[PDB]
Design a protein around this ligand. Structure first.
Ligand SMILES: [Fe+3]
Ligand SMILES: [Fe+3]
Ligand SMILES: [Fe+3]
Ligand SMILES: [Fe+3]
Lengths: 83, 322, 491, 83, 491, 322
């Protein structure tokens, strides 16, 4: 278990979202979407959710796992729509 | 259709916006609307006759008595504000000089002087209360009446101070007779017979103008100079600082009564012949005032000078009015 | 330290003395004092139940105005008056015009006692009473003054009693008789006991509640504040009555009470009755005028009279019966002759209101309702001109109010005429005629509005001339309070 | 011209009504009806309006004129429905 | 006779003396006084513009309470609170809970100056200021106390600041920083100049007007009365700033003002902004929060700073931009997380309200409106559970408020993170992070609600556990003010 | 769901319905909620340390200081009502004794005594103002703090009376130096050095319990007996009735301060060891109080007896507390 701050695209607030060190970025995005999609943001079925480090804008590959991302606990991440 | 006004119709077109005083005190008497039948009943009733003879037929005349304005502009609201503060001061003196044992420090001689010259005043002060309240009910304008209203309240205030101090004195000196002997002193002591004759006679002067003169212009200045000024100065010099301060505090009310009385005389002098009317009344009542001052003050220590001062000070009140 | 009030209070009223330089009768003229053969010593037994001293008075009354004036200032910009029910606005305009200057006049009635009562306790309490009415006259001028720019009608808060408008004449007729032209003792009985203790004390309590219910907190605070002053001086008649009864005057006392209560009732039947049963919105009516009278006025009188050793007035039963009729007539009269008053009378005869009236007064619709039926039909059928008068109604020579009573299916209108010294007088009731007969010299040559009209004193001698005589002009002349909105329910 | 007080049957108020010394009681009733009928009282076409002295109840014949009725100025009269 | 105030006033503040038995630094510890190297003589040039003496204070303030308390008593039975707009009731519950005890705490902030300011005029004015906040804490406890039997929510007028509910933490974070843990001079600047003179004075003026408009005259009289006391002690910062600027400290003065104004703004963006633009009924909105800020707050600051010889804070332009965004986020946050506050948040997003918002804030619907679109659809489609949260939002380590900003078509939400001594801090703005960086030792080990949750200090470590940690239970936990009535417009 | 209560939750179940005093004055301080971190910021800030050392770590202990109740039950509303009346009395004295020319009747000797023993008190009274206001900000309960709040207001009141009279005296005797010379007298006159040393040292006693003791239990009784009781009695006997009455009026405030101080000591004595803690502090400060009284009173006429009386009266205040 590892805490991160989700800054979901088109949402208005950053939120606390607990992910797992073994989660892939895709699974991180899914856990983050749970707190924004269909609550405050409309789904975009034709897009793919990507994870980007908020501070410098580093884009993490879909398959990279938290364990290898070099994140600081509670690190803020942008969850953006792409393709 | 009649359009709404910015003030009362009787005050419209005053140039300056009516004050609270003018809004609540002017042109309120309606018995003056029909001089031939002041009250809404048979015109021959005793009360109809009383107002026609003592209000309307008074030799002290004016075309518009409702124009009179109290220089202090007292209103019920401001009267209570003013006096509540003054009573906070007087009751504060009573409370704290008592805590101090002020009455126990008075000499036996002075205590006996209080029983003779101070406490019997409850009768004289109540007589003034009656005197000013009669003026209230017979004056030709509501603004004149109101000045008499508050003046009456002040006279009751003085009676009340006196009643309170009389009990305090009786508690401190049970043997003197405080509270019990005053009626006999007022009724039988030579020092008081001058004032007693003056106020008893003045109390049956029904003409509103003569009542005003007898009570406010002649009797009050004499009572004030003798009982407040003279007795108060004596009290202070004799160690009774409470009475010295009390008398001075009550003198503030007297000064206010003189201010409105002076304003009424001023207004009256706008009409030819009124000064002469007032001087006639003063001339009739002044001799009794002299007698009052002479009998009371001569019985006080250094009496002859007290008499000279009181006579001079009371006459000065009328002199300054013209 | 300070003394306890009770330890020195008596000295404030130990003020009687034996005159020497003038006689007692000169100092206390019987026509002003009314000592009635009862000695100065006997009058000294007078003991007011509610006691108060100068410092207590100025302190308590200071806070009273501080609060009332503060509430008025806080609610002024709100302009509640501009959105209040029209019936409520009319209630206030009627209120201020009818009593503001009479309240002020009462300070003179109090002054009469302050100078002429032989009872020293009476003299002091009347001095406070004098101050009280000074307050009431002033505050009830200051408050409506805030509305002068809204309607000329508010000017009547000051103007009314200076006019010959019929309602003003009726008011002065009552007040001048009860408190302005009576000896000191009579005033304490007729004014403070009969009228203030008997009617005003409870009336203002109900009025303040009604104001709150109507959403007018400025007026509610005003009336409410005013009535807390009442008993302080209203208490003055009780002690006088005890003294008259324990000495040789139970009959004289009874007669003054009989007269005062009846005259008070007539004024009440026109100034209060119509308001409770017609101007107050249906949903705000906690009880009817009759219910109010039985619960808060009548029983209290019986209790008071019994305790004083007096009897119920000879007219008591009739008085009870009239609670079902009189004010209904006074209301219909005021509404039908609406152009003659300075406020807008509210008809109060919508279907729902008529249901309430039938419930509160069984038989109303078959009597009073029939007059209203005709009036309503004319309004529905476009004949408004048949809802205003073309003549004057007969006026009682005592109460100066129209002579009216039960109409319709139980017609019972009567005139208690009296021919006295070559003149025919008309009276609205048995008791009104009696008040004249026990003291004819007190009312003999007074003339009511009708008498003046018939004498040629109103010129031009027509309705327009009469309106001018009464100082009435378009702008203040009354009309239906809700502008006939209630007619829509009949179409 | 002579003033009388009209106490019209079924009405609620007595009113001032100026009549003429030469009016018959029928004409008096008519002048009185003007201020009550169709204002506060319904007509009764099948009845005849009669004049009665209010104080003692004396019924005056329809054809008698004011001049002969012995009325005091301002005398109150009942105007009643009869037959 | 009496002297004119101006003839003896200076002697009341001619109280400085040269200590001998203790040293000046002992008597005036720098950490409490903040004299900052400026001599006692130089501080004596301090001259408060608004002067007042003890007798004037007790007299004027006595009448103040007489009026306010009298109005409250006169309107109490009316029960206006029971029929007031739900959004208004919420406004008051939020108001009392958030400031009643902080107002009282301000008397200690004033006491800090009364004892430790080297300027004698400051010491006396702070004594009156101490009395003022004593009044404000007490009267704002006495007034809501009247509603305790109506809802447990009113108990929070006293309880709130004693809890760890997030809004209470944010409040204490602000107040403790501005007035409770600063030296005397700092307090006069950060509290009286920046916050009271800069925000509260005008805010209470608008709040009192809003109360009157809502029909609540008790609250209107309360707030109105309270704000007339403000400038008497709010004036204390001005003179301190002049002295710092004319001596060697313009930069130190500027920095305290920069910090205080920003922190004041953040608290204002959550406690006032949402109320003006969402809780106040559409027809009662005289102007928007942004318009209020530009007209009554911003220009005044610029004027004041220019006159003091200071500059506009470095963040001024950004601050101007945020008037279009921040409070909209604070509102959405409070409403979405409504179960976490002690009042019922009003959504304020009906068709008509959204039109107003678009007019007052061009672009609102395409940004803020989109979040609300999703929320509305879920409510219309019976999925209310998607309108409440299942996690905590990220909280700023400075203002302790959620980190939120523009959503929808112009997404611009940013976190100004900072790694300091092995810990990652999150900030809601550039200025919030700056406040930490210029004085890290002042905030270093403080923990916000999220930090505590992540540390294991909240147990059970779930939402129910967090609610308990914040002392929240059904009965006071918030929900939609109008019970979702606005949803009907969408069906 | 939580049901509405009949009073505040912290007062629920009191048996007797909470008074206005309890409703607006109890359990208001929140810095006492977290003794380890009183303020909502970093726990190592100077102010955090200040409250932990001087409030929480005080040897004067109790489990529930919030239980304290002011015997006079003062609230802001009633404080202003009470004092507005008292000021009406004092300002009334100022106004009317002035009208009377009271200051012109004082002897030159006494006027010089006022310049030395009376007017410099503006410094001592302001020092008390500072002393009580520090107690306010460090006391562990809002009810204790409030008593200190109103007490501070009273000290400012005394300063104000003194500032006013100083100008009046300067106007009447321009040559004496009234208003100009007080700082030098307070700083250099032997008669004042005892009090100056006492209050300067007491002013830096930061522990709330020691501040309470040094200021309210030791310094104030000494200041009150010397400057109000002793100087006031002297003033009266010397013809200065204004000061005699003024001092007596201010003594009413002092009596009230003693009442709440006595109540706090009483509460403190519920805990074993507190009496000893308080006696320790009194023992430390008493010697300086004796010095203060000795230096001031010995310089007054009949000084040795003034010293004996003042020492006796001030010690009696503490004796009656236990
Ligand atoms: Fe009255
Ligand atoms: Fe009355
Ligand atoms: Fe405040
Ligand atoms: Fe403030």
């Amino acid at each position: 278990t590892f805490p991160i701050m989700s800054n979901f695209e088109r949402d208005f607030v950053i939120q606390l979202v607990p992910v797992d060190t073994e989660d892939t970025m895709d699974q991180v995005a899914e856990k983050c979407a749970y707190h924004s999609i269909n609550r405050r943001v409309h789904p975009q079925p034709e897009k793919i959710l990507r994870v980007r480090r908020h501070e410098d804008g580093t884009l993490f590959p879909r398959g990279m796992i938290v364990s290898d991302a070099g994140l600081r606990p509670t690190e803020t991440l942008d969850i953006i729509f792409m393709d | 259709a009649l359009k709404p006004l910015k003030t009362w119709s009787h005050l419209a077109g005053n140039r300056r916006r009516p004050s609270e005083y003018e809004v609540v005190s002017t042109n309120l008497h309606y018995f003056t609307d029909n001089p031939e039948r002041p009250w809404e009943l048979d015109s021959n009733l005793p009360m109809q006759t009383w107002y026609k003879k003592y209000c309307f037929d008074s030799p002290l005349k004016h075309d518009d008595w409702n124009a009179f304005r109290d220089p202090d502009q007292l209103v019920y609201r401001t009267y209570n504000l003013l006096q509540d503060g003054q009573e906070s001061y007087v009751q504060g003196l009573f409370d704290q000089l008592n805590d101090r044992g002020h009455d126990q420090m008075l000499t036996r001689e002075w205590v006996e002087t209080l029983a003779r010259f101070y406490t019997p005043a409850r009768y004289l002060f109540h007589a003034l209360q009656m005197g000013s309240v009669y003026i209230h009910q017979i004056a030709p304008a509501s603004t004149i009446t109101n000045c008499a209203t508050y003046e009456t309240a002040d006279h009751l205030r003085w009676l009340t101070h006196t009643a309170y101090r009389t009990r305090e004195l009786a508690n401190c000196y049970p043997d003197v007779g405080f509270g019990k002997r005053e009626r006999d002193v007022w009724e039988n002591d030579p020092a008081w017979q001058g004032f007693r004759e003056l106020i008893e006679k003045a109390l049956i002067a029904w003409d509103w103008g003569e009542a005003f003169t007898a009570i406010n212009l002649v009797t009050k200045p004499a009572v004030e100079e003798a009982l407040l000024q003279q007795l108060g100065s004596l009290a202070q010099s004799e160690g009774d600082t409470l009475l010295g301060l009390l008398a001075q505090a009550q003198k503030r009310d007297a000064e206010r009564h003189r201010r409105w009385s002076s304003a009424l005389v001023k207004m009256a002098l706008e009409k030819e012949g009124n000064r002469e009317v007032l001087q006639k009344w003063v001339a009739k009542w002044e001799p009794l005032a002299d007698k009052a001052i002479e009998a009371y003050c001569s019985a006080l220590p250094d009496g002859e000078n007290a008499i000279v001062e009181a006579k001079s000070a009371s006459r000065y009140v009328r002199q300054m009015m013209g | 330290s300070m003394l306890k009030r009770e330890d020195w209070y008596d000295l404030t009223r130990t003020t009687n003395w034996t005159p020497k330089y003038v006689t007692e009768n000169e100092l206390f003229p019987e026509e002003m004092s009314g000592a009635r053969g009862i000695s100065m010593e006997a009058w000294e037994k007078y003991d007011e139940p509610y006691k108060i001293t100068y410092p207590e008075y100025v302190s308590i009354q200071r806070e009273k105005d501080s609060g009332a004036y503060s509430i008025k200032a806080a609610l002024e910009r709100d302009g509640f008056v501009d959105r209040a029910d029209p019936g409520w606005v009319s209630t206030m305009q009627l209120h201020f015009g009818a009593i503001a200057l009479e309240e002020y006049a009462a300070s003179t009635a109090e002054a009469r006692m302050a100078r002429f009562a032989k009872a020293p306790g009476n003299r002091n309490m009347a001095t406070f009473g004098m101050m009280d009415e000074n307050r009431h006259g002033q505050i009830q001028l200051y408050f409506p003054y805030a509305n002068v720019k809204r309607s000329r009608k508010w000017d009547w808060a000051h103007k009314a009693i200076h006019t010959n408008e019929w309602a003003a004449i009726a008011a002065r007729s009552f007040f001048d008789d009860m408190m302005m032209t009576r000896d000191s003792v009579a005033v304490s009985i007729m004014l403070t006991f009969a009228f203030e203790t008997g009617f005003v004390n409870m009336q203002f309590l109900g009025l303040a509640a009604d104001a709150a219910e109507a959403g007018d907190h400025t007026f509610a605070s005003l009336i409410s504040s005013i009535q807390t002053d009442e008993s302080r001086h209203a208490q003055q008649g009780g002690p006088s009555l005890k003294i008259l009864v324990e000495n040789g005057k139970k009959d004289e006392a009874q007669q003054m009470v009989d007269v005062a209560i009846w005259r008070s009732w007539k004024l009440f039947s026109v100034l209060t009755g119509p308001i409770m049963d017609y101007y107050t919105p249906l949903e705000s009516r906690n009880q009817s005028f009759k219910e109010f009278m039985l619960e808060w006025i009548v029983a209290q009188f019986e209790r008071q009279l019994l305790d004083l050793g007096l009897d119920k007035p000879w007219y008591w039963d009739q008085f009870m019966q009239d609670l079902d009729e009189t004010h209904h007539g006074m209301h219909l009269g005021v509404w039908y002759w609406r152009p003659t008053v300075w406020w807008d009378p509210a008809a109060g005869v919508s279907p729902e209101e008529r249901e309430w009236l039938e419930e509160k007064y069984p038989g109303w619709n078959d009597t009073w309702g029939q007059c209203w039926d005709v009036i309503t039909d004319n309004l529905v059928n476009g004949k408004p001109e048949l809802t205003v008068p073309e003549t004057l109604p007969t006026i009682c020579n005592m109460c100066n109010l129209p002579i009216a009573h039960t109409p319709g299916n139980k017609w019972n209108v009567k005139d208690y005429q009296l021919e006295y010294e070559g003149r025919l007088y008309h009276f609205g009731s048995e008791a009104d005629r009696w008040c004249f007969q026990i003291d004819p010299e007190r009312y003999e040559n007074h003339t009511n509005l009708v008498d003046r009209f018939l004498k040629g004193e109103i010129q031009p001698a027509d309705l327009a001339g009469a309106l001018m005589y009464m100082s009435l002009e378009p702008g203040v002349m009354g009309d239906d309070a809700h502008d006939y909105e209630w007619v829509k329910a009949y179409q």
